[PDB]
């Protein structure tokens, strides 16, 4: 019986815009779209 | 951008941080200097 999975903490800014200031600025124009993603992954880790 | 506690409270936007651990940001070492090295040629192009 499986009990857990590998816990992941994928990060928006680095994953989508590798250390690029203009890319991060234009990502900020998408609002709190991906803070949801970080929250969901944290929830997955805690649940595991 | 003051103390770890300051960054934590700022992350959850609340003056009261309950006991726990909170993932707030990421850390990267900014570069010191920068080696740019191209090929070993010098001859000028004939755009003239």
Sequence-distant (6+) residues with CB within 8 A of A16 are A23, A27, A34
The reply to whether B26 touches chain A by the CB within 8 Å rule is yes
Quote the CA–CA distance of B8 and B24 in Å, as a whole number: 6
Q: Do residues B7 and B24 make contact, with C-beta atoms less than 8 angstroms apart?
A: yes
Q: How many interchain CB pairs under 8 A, A with B?
A: 7
Taking residue B22's Cβ as centre, other Cβ atoms within 10 Å add up to 13
Task: Tell me if A12 sits within 8 A of A37, measured CB to CB.
Answer: yes
Find the closest chain A residue to B31 by CA distance.
A19
Q: Do A9 and B26 make contact, defined as CB atoms within 8 angstroms?
A: no
């Amino acid at each position: 019986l499986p009990v857990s999975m590998t816990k992941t903490s994928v990060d928006c800014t680095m994953y989508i815009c590798g250390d690029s200031t203009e890319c991060s600025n234009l990502l900020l124009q998408y609002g709190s779209f991906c803070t949801q993603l970080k929250r969901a992954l944290t929830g997955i880790a805690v649940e595991q | 951008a003051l103390d770890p506690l300051s960054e934590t409270k700022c992350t959850l936007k609340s003056f009261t941080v309950e006991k726990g651990i909170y993932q707030t940001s990421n850390f990267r070492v900014q570069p010191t200097e920068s080696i740019v090295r191209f090929p070993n040629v010098t001859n000028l192009c004939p755009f003239h």
